[PDB]
């Protein structure tokens, strides 16, 4: 939630990793609980040795973290489905991003809310003449 | 017209003495030189084509024109009615990928009744579909 507990995996070091945006604007951090000491391909580049137990990996974009989560959930026979993706600011605060409700978004649970859901078809969208100078969008209003 | 005919043009009569033999017949340039004499030429010695619709020059344009208007219509009718008779057998996709070649040969031979069949299909209503039962695009 606010503190990241984990060890860095065995990796020699790469060039496509954390650039100067990490210590300035934001970075991301994936934490998961392994079973054995297997090998995984990080989206930064090359392969790395996944450490045994709870390990922590710092990445630069959220898409790399979700691509690693896809690689952890599909490309292993002990399917690692207990990973947590946090967003780390340079101020020190840590925001729990995924799977923050607690259950994966692919299945439904009670406690979520329908954000960004329309009550019409796309053919029932309004025309851009009646809202020509309101400043809004033809899909929003 | 301001164009001189090839029977008396001086540049054409100067150029017809050395027409090149196209085919293996060694007198092909000479028989071409007397075949193109009926046409009319400009000031360069090449046969122009009057296309205005006057029948005295219809051999330039109109006589091959309707000739193509047969053959294209033949191909069009052979391509059209064949699709109609593969609108259902069991599956039209394979019958469009591989050809039902006896059915195709039957249409290819029978396609020479195409203009009377075209007026017949236009009168029966099975040529032009309705403007509402056609899968149009949204406005």
């Amino acid at each position: 939630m606010t503190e990241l507990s984990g060890q860095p995996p065995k990796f020699g070091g790469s060039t496509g990793g954390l650039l100067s945006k990490a210590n300035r604007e934001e970075k991301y951090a994936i934490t998961w609980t392994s079973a054995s000491e297997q090998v995984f391909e990080m989206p930064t580049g090359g392969a790395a040795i996944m450490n045994e137990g709870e390990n922590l990996l710092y990445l630069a974009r959220k898409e790399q973290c979700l691509a690693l989560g896809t690689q952890l959930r599909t490309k292993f026979k002990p399917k690692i489905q207990d990973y947590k993706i946090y967003r780390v600011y340079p101020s020190g605060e840590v925001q729990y991003l995924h799977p923050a409700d607690g259950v994966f978004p692919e299945k439904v649970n009670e406690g979520r809310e329908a954000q960004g859901t329309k009550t019409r078809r796309i053919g029932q969208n309004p025309e851009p003449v009646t809202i020509k100078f309101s400043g809004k969008a033809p899909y929003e209003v | 017209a301001n164009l001189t005919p090839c029977s008396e043009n001086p540049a054409y009569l100067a150029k017809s003495k050395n027409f090149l033999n196209t085919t293996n017949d060694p007198n092909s340039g000479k028989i071409r030189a007397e075949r193109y004499a009926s046409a009319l030429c400009g000031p360069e010695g090449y046969p122009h084509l009057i296309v205005d619709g006057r029948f005295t020059h219809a051999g330039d344009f109109l006589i091959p024109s309707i000739l193509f208007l047969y053959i294209a219509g033949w191909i069009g009718w052979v391509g059209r009615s064949y699709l109609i008779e593969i609108r259902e057998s069991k599956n039209p996709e394979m019958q469009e990928v591989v050809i039902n070649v006896p059915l195709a040969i039957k249409k290819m031979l029978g396609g020479f009744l195409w203009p009377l069949a075209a007026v017949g299909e236009y009168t029966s209503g099975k040529l032009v579909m309705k403007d509402s039962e056609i899968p149009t695009s949204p406005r």
Binding site: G135 | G45, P138
Partner: protein, 729 residues
């Protein structure tokens, strides 16, 4: 971030694309945060005055440079052999060969020979010394300052025009037909008869002279009473010398018809009488629409009354569609301006109305090609603003069953028939060209298909050309339309039968095929543009294109993958077609007039019927003097056009990079360049404020389109100018 001020969504992204998108949406005032309906019109009005002052500064700059650095006083002494001078050269990179070759037309400084028609214009207007057109340059500077002050004062809240003033269509169509098109043509006919025609008669009329002498010795009273034949009493005879008094009978409005035999131009009295006869009809037609006075017409009742059985609901509820929107008005304005700009081009080479401009062949070629390349732009922009109107400003619940909605209801018939016409012209024009090119390649050019263009020759036959022998309606002298006793019979007949001028040129068998090629380019460009305008709202792929806007990159790789799905991308392809067909007609025009001016008409009449004749006798032969603008031996005055030739080739191929390659490659490359700058030791001091990204998809499409366009234009303005200035200069 302060830039851009108008857009809030572009003032917050840290990327470098907000600078480009802030540049290219600076004039789209509809997508500005916080702009109401009337502020749109008032900002348009002030920006209109800014543009109308920029165009006066440009005309004043042309006038000032002909006054200052031009040999205008030495050009009027012998305008058949000496060359006009645009301006002087002051770049410090000139060596010695580039100074010894650019001191042309008799001037010790390096100059630049003018190829626009400003010298023949200013001589036909009546300007003789440099002082009067320098005073015209100062007058245009003051007039441009006047329109700048108008643009400033029409932004104050006191003098701010209301929205109902801009919606007042009938109270400005009257003033644009009478007080702008009529009384200004009336003032131009007045300047013609007062200054331009007496300077063609030798009498120097200035601002301190026109109040004393009359243009006609009969006075103003024969116009007030009647019997106007004394205004055409004695015209200028065939033995008249321009600018002097020699055989020049004084009569201000003489309708002759045909050409001046000394200047190969129209008679200046005929020009003045024409402008009077158009000013009268424009002031008459300006009193049509209803204003505060109850007499006139209101356009709502005219449009609502034009119904029909086959038409549908007619033009009902259509005045509000044009008057509320602005892209409909801009599309109609650009369409009418494009057709009349090509009308300018087609009537400034066959009916020249400037002193000795039919002899300066490079000037006529540059002016014709410039106006055709403006007309193609304006036609493409008319259809582009039609697509913007269909995206933004079209409502189907108010335009119900009228001609616009019924146009949209059968768009799959329209663009399929344009597809048929384009394939019909294209398959067989290319088929005949490849057939001709093969049979000439096989040594048998008698097997060419040379279809005689009998329809156009029939039009020349009913225009006056008795060359083809078709005795129809004007070449037959006993016709009904010939024996009417009108004024334009003998002069126009002898002008159209003279085989020296460029009026109604002898149409040979090649012009049949090339005019079918221009019909091909016109039909295909109309195909892409109408398909863009009618599918601007939607289609079977995405019927929410009204919701996405005009220009947007794609809709992803799904549903087949909709690259170039917007109507902006139909403009994109139609821009290449407009450049292509304008290149076709200008290659055709320049080769025809190179056969006419040199007297070797047989070269164009023999070689243009096949494609290698174009590739040999036009592109390979006429460009021999262009590429020899700088050899290892020496440098002549055509070196700047050889450098512009290679420059145009370079920009035309630079657009190929943005066209062929797409964004994702360049983003992966820019990631590596960003890494190299962030890990270089001594360049870690200098860091970007905005994050550098690749150019966007629609953006770099537009950049590659711009390079294709200006590369095309620069290499053709190099070749078209230098080839006919090397042949005739």
């Amino acid at each position: 971030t302060k830039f851009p001020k108008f857009s809030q969504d572009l003032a917050q992204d840290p990327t470098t694309r907000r600078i480009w998108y802030g540049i290219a949406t600076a004039h789209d005032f509809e997508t500005h945060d916080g702009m109401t309906e009337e502020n749109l019109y008032q900002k348009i009005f002030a920006s209109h005055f800014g543009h109308i002052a920029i165009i006066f500064l440009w005309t004043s700059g042309t006038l000032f440079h002909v006054a200052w650095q031009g040999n205008f006083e030495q050009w009027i002494k012998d305008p058949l052999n000496i060359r006009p001078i645009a301006h002087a050269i002051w770049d410090p990179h000139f060596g010695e060969g580039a100074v010894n070759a650019f001191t042309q037309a008799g001037a010790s400084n390096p100059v630049n020979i003018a190829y626009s028609g400003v010298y023949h214009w200013f001589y036909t207007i009546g300007m003789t010394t440099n002082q009067e057109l320098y005073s015209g340059a100062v007058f245009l500077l003051v007039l441009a300052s006047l329109f700048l002050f108008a643009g400033w004062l029409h932004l104050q809240p006191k003098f701010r025009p209301s929205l109902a003033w801009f919606k007042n269509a009938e109270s400005r169509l009257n003033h644009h037909l009478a007080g702008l098109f009529g009384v200004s043509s009336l003032a131009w006919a007045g300047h013609l008869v007062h200054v331009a025609i007496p300077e063609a008669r030798g009498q120097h009329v200035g601002w301190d002279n026109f109040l004393s002498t009359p243009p006609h010795p009969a006075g103003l009273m024969p116009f007030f009473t009647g019997n106007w034949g004394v205004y055409a009493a004695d015209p200028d005879t065939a033995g008249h010398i321009f600018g002097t008094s020699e055989g020049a009978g004084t009569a201000i409005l003489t309708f002759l018809g045909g050409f001046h035999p000394q200047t190969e131009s129209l008679w200046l009295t005929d020009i003045a009488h024409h402008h009077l006869a158009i000013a009268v009809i424009f002031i008459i037609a300006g009193h049509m629409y209803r204003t505060n006075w109850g007499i006139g017409h209101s356009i709502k009742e005219i449009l609502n009354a034009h119904k029909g059985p086959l038409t549908g609901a007619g033009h009902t509820n259509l005045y509000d569609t044009i008057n509320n929107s602005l892209h409909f008005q801009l599309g109609l304005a650009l369409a009418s301006l494009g057709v009349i700009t090509s009308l300018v081009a087609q009537h400034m080479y066959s009916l020249p109305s400037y002193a000795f401009i039919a002899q300066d062949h490079t000037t006529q070629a540059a002016l014709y090609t410039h106006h055709q390349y403006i007309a193609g732009f304006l036609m493409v922009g008319a259809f582009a603003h039609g697509a913007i109107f269909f995206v933004r400003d079209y409502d189907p619940v108010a335009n119900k069953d009228n001609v616009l909605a019924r146009m949209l209801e059968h768009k799959e018939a329209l663009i399929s028939h344009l597809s048929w016409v384009s394939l019909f012209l294209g398959f067989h024009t290319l088929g005949l060209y490849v057939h001709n090119d093969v049979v000439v390649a096989f040594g048998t050019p008698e097997k060419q298909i040379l279809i005689e263009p009998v329809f156009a020759q029939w039009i020349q036959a009913t225009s006056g050309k008795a060359l083809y022998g078709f005795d129809v309606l004007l070449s037959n002298p006993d016709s009904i339309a010939s024996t009417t006793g009108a004024a334009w019979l003998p002069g126009w007949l002898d002008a159209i039968n003279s085989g020296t001028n460029s009026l109604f040129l002898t149409i040979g068998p090649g012009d049949f095929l090339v005019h079918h090629a221009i019909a091909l380019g016109l039909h295909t460009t109309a195909l892409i543009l109408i398909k863009g305008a009618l599918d601007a709202r939607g289609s079977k792929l995405m019927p929410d294109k009204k919701d996405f806007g005009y220009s947007f990159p794609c809709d992803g790789p799904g549903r087949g993958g909709t690259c170039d799905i917007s109507a902006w991308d139909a403009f994109y392809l139609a821009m290449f077609w407009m450049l292509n067909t304008l290149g076709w007609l200008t290659f055709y025009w320049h080769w025809k007039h190179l056969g006419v001016w040199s007297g070797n008409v047989a070269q164009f009449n023999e070689n243009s019927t096949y494609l290698m004749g174009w590739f040999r006798d036009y592109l390979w032969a006429n460009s021999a003097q262009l590429i020899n603008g700088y050899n290892p031996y020496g440098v002549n005055n055509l070196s700047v056009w050889a450098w512009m030739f290679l420059f145009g080739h370079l920009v035309w191929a630079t657009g190929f990079m943005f066209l062929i390659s797409w964004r994702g490659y360049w983003q992966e490359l820019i990631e590596t360049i960003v890494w190299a700058h962030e890990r270089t030791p001594l360049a870690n001091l200098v860091r970007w404020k905005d994050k550098p990204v690749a150019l966007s998809i629609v953006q770099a499409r537009l950049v590659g389109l711009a390079h294709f366009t200006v590369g095309y234009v620069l290499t053709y303005a190099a070749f078209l100018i230098a080839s006919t200035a090397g042949k005739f200069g």
